[PDB]
Design a protein around this ligand. Sequence first.
Ligand SMILES: Nc1ncnc2c1ncn2[C@@H]1O[C@H](COP(=O)(O)OP(=O)(O)NP(=O)(O)O)[C@@H](O)[C@H]1O
Ligand SMILES: Nc1ncnc2c1ncn2[C@@H]1O[C@H](COP(=O)(O)OP(=O)(O)NP(=O)(O)O)[C@@H](O)[C@H]1O
Ligand SMILES: Nc1ncnc2c1ncn2[C@@H]1O[C@H](COP(=O)(O)OP(=O)(O)NP(=O)(O)O)[C@@H](O)[C@H]1O
Ligand SMILES: Nc1ncnc2c1ncn2[C@@H]1O[C@H](COP(=O)(O)OP(=O)(O)NP(=O)(O)O)[C@@H](O)[C@H]1O
Ligand SMILES: N[C@@H](CC(=O)O)C(=O)O
Ligand SMILES: N[C@@H](CC(=O)O)C(=O)O
Ligand SMILES: N[C@@H](CC(=O)O)C(=O)O
Ligand SMILES: N[C@@H](CC(=O)O)C(=O)O
Ligand SMILES: [Mg+2]
Ligand SMILES: [Mg+2]
Ligand SMILES: [Mg+2]
Ligand SMILES: [Mg+2]
Lengths: 466, 468, 465, 465
Amino acid sequence: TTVMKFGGTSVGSGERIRHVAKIVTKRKKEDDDVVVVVSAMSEVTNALVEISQQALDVRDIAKVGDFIKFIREKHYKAIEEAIKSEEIKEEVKKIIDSRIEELEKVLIGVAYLGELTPKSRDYILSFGERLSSPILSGAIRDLGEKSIALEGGEAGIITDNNFGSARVKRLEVKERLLPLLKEGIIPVVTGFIGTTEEGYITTLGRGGSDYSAALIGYGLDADIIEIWTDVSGVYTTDPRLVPTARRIPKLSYIEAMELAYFGAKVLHPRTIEPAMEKGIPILVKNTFEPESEGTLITNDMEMSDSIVKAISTIKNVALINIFGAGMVGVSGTAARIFKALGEEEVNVILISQGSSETNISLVVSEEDVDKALKALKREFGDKSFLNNNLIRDVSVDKDVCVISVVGAGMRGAKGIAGKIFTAVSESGANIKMIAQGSSEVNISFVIDEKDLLNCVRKLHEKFIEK
Amino acid sequence: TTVMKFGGTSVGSGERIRHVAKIVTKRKKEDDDVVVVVSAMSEVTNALVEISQQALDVRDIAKVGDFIKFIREKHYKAIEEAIKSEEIKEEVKKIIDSRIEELEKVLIGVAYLGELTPKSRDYILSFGERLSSPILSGAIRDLGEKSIALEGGEAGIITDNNFGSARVKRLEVKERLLPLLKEGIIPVVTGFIGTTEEGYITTLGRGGSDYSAALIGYGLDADIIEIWTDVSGVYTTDPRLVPTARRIPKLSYIEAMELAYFGAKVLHPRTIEPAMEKGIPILVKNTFEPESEGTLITNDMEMSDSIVKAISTIKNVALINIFGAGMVGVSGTAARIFKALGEEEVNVILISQGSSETNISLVVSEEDVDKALKALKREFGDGKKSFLNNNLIRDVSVDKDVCVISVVGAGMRGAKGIAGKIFTAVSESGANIKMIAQGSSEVNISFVIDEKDLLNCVRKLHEKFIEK
Amino acid sequence: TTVMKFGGTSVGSGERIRHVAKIVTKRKKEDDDVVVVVSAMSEVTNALVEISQQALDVRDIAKVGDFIKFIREKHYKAIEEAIKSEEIKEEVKKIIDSRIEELEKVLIGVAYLGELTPKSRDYILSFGERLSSPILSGAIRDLGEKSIALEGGEAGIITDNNFGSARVKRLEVKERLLPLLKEGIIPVVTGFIGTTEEGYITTLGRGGSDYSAALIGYGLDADIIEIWTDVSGVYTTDPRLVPTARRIPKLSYIEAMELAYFGAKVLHPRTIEPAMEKGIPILVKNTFEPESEGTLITNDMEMSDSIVKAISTIKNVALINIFGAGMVGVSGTAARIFKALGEEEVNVILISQGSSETNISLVVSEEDVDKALKALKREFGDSFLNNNLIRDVSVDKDVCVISVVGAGMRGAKGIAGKIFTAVSESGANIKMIAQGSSEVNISFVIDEKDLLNCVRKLHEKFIEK
Amino acid sequence: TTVMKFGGTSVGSGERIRHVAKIVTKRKKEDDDVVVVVSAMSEVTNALVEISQQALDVRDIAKVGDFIKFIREKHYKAIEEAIKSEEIKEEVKKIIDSRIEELEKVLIGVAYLGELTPKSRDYILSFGERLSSPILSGAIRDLGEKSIALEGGEAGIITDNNFGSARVKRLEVKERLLPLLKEGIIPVVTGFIGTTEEGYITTLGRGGSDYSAALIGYGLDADIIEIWTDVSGVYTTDPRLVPTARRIPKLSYIEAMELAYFGAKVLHPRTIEPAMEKGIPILVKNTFEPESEGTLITNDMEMSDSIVKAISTIKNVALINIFGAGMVGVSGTAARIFKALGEEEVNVILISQGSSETNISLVVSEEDVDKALKALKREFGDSFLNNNLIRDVSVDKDVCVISVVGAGMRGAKGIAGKIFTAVSESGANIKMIAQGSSEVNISFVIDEKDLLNCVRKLHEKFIEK
Ligand SMILES: Nc1ncnc2c1ncn2[C@@H]1O[C@H](COP(=O)(O)OP(=O)(O)NP(=O)(O)O)[C@@H](O)[C@H]1O
Ligand SMILES: Nc1ncnc2c1ncn2[C@@H]1O[C@H](COP(=O)(O)OP(=O)(O)NP(=O)(O)O)[C@@H](O)[C@H]1O
Ligand SMILES: Nc1ncnc2c1ncn2[C@@H]1O[C@H](COP(=O)(O)OP(=O)(O)NP(=O)(O)O)[C@@H](O)[C@H]1O
Ligand SMILES: Nc1ncnc2c1ncn2[C@@H]1O[C@H](COP(=O)(O)OP(=O)(O)NP(=O)(O)O)[C@@H](O)[C@H]1O
Ligand SMILES: N[C@@H](CC(=O)O)C(=O)O
Ligand SMILES: N[C@@H](CC(=O)O)C(=O)O
Ligand SMILES: N[C@@H](CC(=O)O)C(=O)O
Ligand SMILES: N[C@@H](CC(=O)O)C(=O)O
Ligand SMILES: [Mg+2]
Ligand SMILES: [Mg+2]
Ligand SMILES: [Mg+2]
Ligand SMILES: [Mg+2]
């Protein structure tokens, strides 16, 4: 049993989709049990996001009409450049047309009403994967192989109704997919999406097609999860930021999860958990360079001579400093802070507290800042050591980034902290926050956004290039 | 208005008590309004803690009487060696006797009942100061000046009834002391203690005689709060760990507060709060070197060339690592963690979170580990792991063989290069950093290392940043 | 300052709308300061509810089209039948046409989107009053008097945004209406709608047009609030259940409120609070029998010889019995039960608890049963040695609540005995009793099938003696 | 396997203790597996309660000394009058002396410190059973039988640390007692007490000795639990209130549990659950009339013609009326009320809600009134446009709860009518009714002064006929 997941650029044109179909069909000969997971064509999820908000805010029906045309022309072109059979192209076009009509009505409804609920937002977003998967499945059929396209819920991924990033509730993957695999059919499953218990389409979070692959692998007790992307594995850093980045042949589950979580886009952080608890290896491969060995992700852990295998960053974060009202009790005041933040579903990335004033430092997603301050005003409302006030003030610095350094044995490595932070200084970066102790393999810290490149480059020179 | 506080060693013997009385009476001829705060004689609060526990655990009444004779003879000897007047010795002796009768009555009651409530414990501990204040007062009277001994509550410190570490609710310092300063009386006030609203004696936490002084100073709008200890101010580190520790002439409120809070025993961390919010300057002085300038703590803040002015430690802490169940939401699971700990009144010193598994690192006071472990089991109900399962916490580990080291100075957080310099120094000392806190304080960086490596680490940091 | 509210049947045709405008213009000559509150025409709110559900569920645009034609034809007919002046008819028709357009757009939007939010439902429902109010207003102008139609929000009713049942947050009634009355104009204000702080149209709950009148009366410091309906005041019970029901000339504020709350449709329960707050009397009158004295509602209270002055019923309820796991602590499990139910916004009507097993009986709205069950599932999950609080839960939907009301109830000796022997003499079996928490009300639960008989028997013994 | 529990009056003197040892010794010959549970001698627990408070409030040491002499003389007399053997008397007196020594020190501690925590009370209270059990065990040994006295904790009863009314956590009975029974030993276990996990003595609540018997019975899978008291079973009401009370030969678990819970002092309410869940019969017998059949409590349930087999009362209760701020949401305001009361461990006995104002009626223990008022003010603090939940709260302590119990109560047509007309003819005025939540029980509140007359009237009507 092999699950093969392909990303947006891997299916970014018809030529590409057909290439992907050939990779799948070749694997089919080695392992007769193949499930494919597929994302939306490159950039369409982004376009779906922007048109939803345009349809909501400006409410312009010509603008929606232009989007539809672009989406139609792109997927028609894909079909024509991916499939040779007239019969198959015709049946794929029929499905794409059906989805496009459905897409159009909903977008017009949003504009008529000036209303876009999280539920409707998830539904619109689902169209990306639901437009690409019939094409890939058709292209596999065109190559003489049995195939059908399926949505994530009907493939067995059941979630709660937290539209935006629904958590997975239940898996019916074996029930839904085993009958298909037994008839020798290659199911092409939509990434990114699941289903609510009542059948409402749900998304799993941006990047979530990787997670779908792991969920389907876990559910089927798969032999391997193959992540097919546009780089040859996980690298020592984002190869788009630092050209001298190197492929890491082997990574542990925890190393990989920490890297993904702290900004390595190649893997959605939630990909690791299901594979990890069933011991299913993950292989990250390049669809544009299929002979490359990529990165194999397993339980195997080895330290490297220098301690730091990789560097990741998150840019879309803010630094929130809460000022305490003196020695008012750190556990009592944190309890109320995090109650408020939790109630509001604010995503906190990093926590530090070491202050007689009961100040606390927090990194949150930049989009969650207003929700955080909102939540904090509700909790504490609006001085003196004799009153019962816990909080004095709050400051937020949005012009900031989190940099994380990851390698086995990190926490236990003597001298590594010193080496990290003197290097950070030498790049010209000024450290606003540090987190160490809660991870076996990770050190994270905050610097000014402007210094991100110089800092990553210097860390890369010191630890990877030597 | 000047308030002078004297520590246990400063009043460690009758001779020492008189020397202290002399210091005060020399100040009364510079400032007419002098209020004294005094601690129990050296080592007696500890003795009281230990006899309390013994009266509860072994319940031997002959063993109580052995302690009563020790306290009697120590305070009698002190009266003898502090005061020259026979009338005053007789006067002070009666007060001491009356306190000893009450002490014995309660230690026996605890042995009879077999129960020691925080209320009873707070009463027992208050005897340290209620025995020393009349002796010092008597010594001041002996040097020809008016003086009476007072307890914290009747000096105007009102608290809640959280016996052990009562928080100050309310101040009546001016109401209580003004009529006495007005008549030229030097009140000798018991540090460490205050009163519940219905009159029950309460303690303010260990080391809280420094805090009493600040509360009185605040209550009086005092011109200066003088802390008289057994070192010539606040030093670059503990002079007993590092003999080459240097006196720091000047310190800002926030620097001293962070130092005290992270292990500088010279000041109880709560001392700064009331002084700072009225701008009352704190002078830390040596009773055994009264000519020394000491340390002056004010709003004045000045960066040191080598950022890092002082180094402090806490030994009596434990490192608790909470292992999360995966990506389960840090704020939500932090909310539940800190609720449980807050409910149990667990003292958390340091927090660090940076983990895809929702792990969190915690430093707590060492004696709160059982409370914390208890609180978390109630909160989370101990199973798993499954990503489909709704559990939040996978496991918990504690390491009590740990210490926290803190490094303090005006430009700390804003200073480029300092963290790397600190942590390379820490490694050069042989230590393995288990936790780091940076960001939440302007002047402080704290980290956790193995307890065995404490001295060497402090030595290396003091070498690199202070000595040169 | 007189506020006059007219119901759906009272403005249930063009002819009736003109008769109403004739009552209003007659009042204007006694009180120069008159404000009209008007409901949607009879049955249109109901039709609006069903077309919303239809637009969401099947999503047929042609069925929406058929509805727009019904709502247009209905209201065009009314304009032609209420107003003489051709100019005013054309004036009122343009207002109606603008509303229909807005209505059509939302209903198409709902069908295209496949989602009907509470915000969208409230907007759709509001069209009823927003269509009927300019027809009444135009008819008032057709009788020679100055008038304009306003919405509840623009007339000063500001609410939170709990769409469907929004709570009144703030009033600007005096501020917006006083200038209109200063010029001699008669405002015709829409009944069950308010506005959010940002101008979103909100509804006040079914029946809420009576509540608007009380709200407008309160804000204006009115001298009287007049409720015009199709019965001559509050009766000893529903005259549709019992032909021989009697008009009650006078009722106290608390008596009226308990009756309404426990099912006397003539008044929305929330009508009483604003009135009672400022001691503004409420007069309930029959538009079809205008010379009847009807019912005067004030602070005046007086016991009947036979305590028990009225009987009310609620049919659309369920009896929920929660089975405790033994002596597990009543206030603690009660805490978790009502937390869960509060969280799910479940409407509980009645609570009884008196059980060594920590059992508890609840009456809830029949439409709240699924929510309620779901909440208790989420809350409780799933020996005397484990910590389980709940054993099981049962629901009986084939149930009704009957309430008896009159001054002196709780304090009158023997009345509980007389009530329940009567109930028994009707053939009914009592499933739950509430007594103690009201000075003026006793409530109890029986099988739905015994409703009419029990009401009749109660009316026999206590009213017709 | 038989558990035999004897109450305070049953062991209220030395002659009585010896008579009890004879009943146990007779049973021993029919069933070799006998465990005895015993209470403190009559009135001793109350004496311990009063001298505790005196030691706290007045702190007179010679007054404690007078108590010690009273306790010593009583128990020395019981020893002399119960046991013939000098050697056993000597051996029991030595045990009694250790306890009295310990008891005297504790009470002197209380006066010295001027403090009495719940932990200390339980410890002091436990001395009653720890003083009588050695005497009874001595008397059993005096009659040629092997016997040892044991405390509840060491017999296998482990509780949480809720001193005063600790909940049973864990039972270890088989483990501790089975080895004793196998050697022919009759364990005499102190009723009323358990042990915290770390060894602290805990009480199970007043009346708790009955509960101990059921716990021990459940723990051993006993064939029967014998509750030996000073009446011949459970009666139709308290025979001390109504001399014409009749013994009820047979009761179901639920009938006996509801009655106990609602005031039938003969059984602690928690007695029934452990027996019920293992189907162990409870036989209630008279130690002064051992030949009477008593009352047998099992699963068997039978309706009586008059439905109402028994009337119980609770006197030490208060009626709390919480006044709501209006139509503010009952589930939501109920949520906050029961949270506050649950947090303060307030024992609520009865609940009724049925009010348009969100009023709620509550019956709580009379001792808990201040707890409840303090918690309510902590929850809510001190216009309809205001998000207020609670207007006010009044308490009435001059109140009692009356409960009527019998199989088929809830499903019986006409019974409520009959009950409440009877209440009226007693001259009582009903302040609260609870019905619905129990299959076998109807409860209501009246003025405390009307209690005797109400019970008598109910008894006349339903029992005597
Ligand atoms: N440490 C890293 N190693 C490798 N690639 C990285 C790393 N960090 C960031 N990246 C970037 O991650 C990209 C792959 O992620 P992504 O753009 O999501 O492709 P995908 O997952 O195949 N497509 P989709 O399924 O539509 O999200 C690469 O193009 C890299 O630029
Ligand atoms: N940074 C520091 N500077 C100076 N002294 C320090 C520092 N850190 C720790 N110490 C120690 O703290 C001691 C003073 O504290 P302590 O003995 O409690 O003072 P005290 O207030 O005079 N006595 P008491 O009032 O009974 O607590 C000194 O003797 C030092 O050994
Ligand atoms: N005790 C009662 N007294 C009088 N009428 C009652 C009573 N109980 C129920 N009703 C019914 O209540 C009806 C009046 O309310 P109803 O007509 O439904 O509201 P309305 O205010 O007149 N119109 P609308 O504004 O659209 O609600 C009467 O037709 C009666 O059938
Ligand atoms: N319905 C009832 N039937 C029988 N007795 C009742 C009833 N209601 C109350 N009682 C009283 O309950 C008393 C028995 O309980 P109680 O006085 O606790 O005896 P005990 O349990 O044997 N002694 P102790 O173990 O010290 O509590 C009887 O004397 C009756 O007066
Ligand atoms: N297509 C989705 C899911 C994914 O790319 O993994 C997104 O743009 O986020
Ligand atoms: N409170 C006194 C006594 C003590 O804590 O030991 C002090 O400041 O030291
Ligand atoms: N027309 C609205 C308002 C009312 O009837 O009072 C409704 O049907 O509920
Ligand atoms: N002796 C205890 C226990 C009992 O009587 O059952 C009491 O007085 O309550
Ligand atoms: Mg991706
Ligand atoms: Mg000190
Ligand atoms: Mg109506
Ligand atoms: Mg009893």
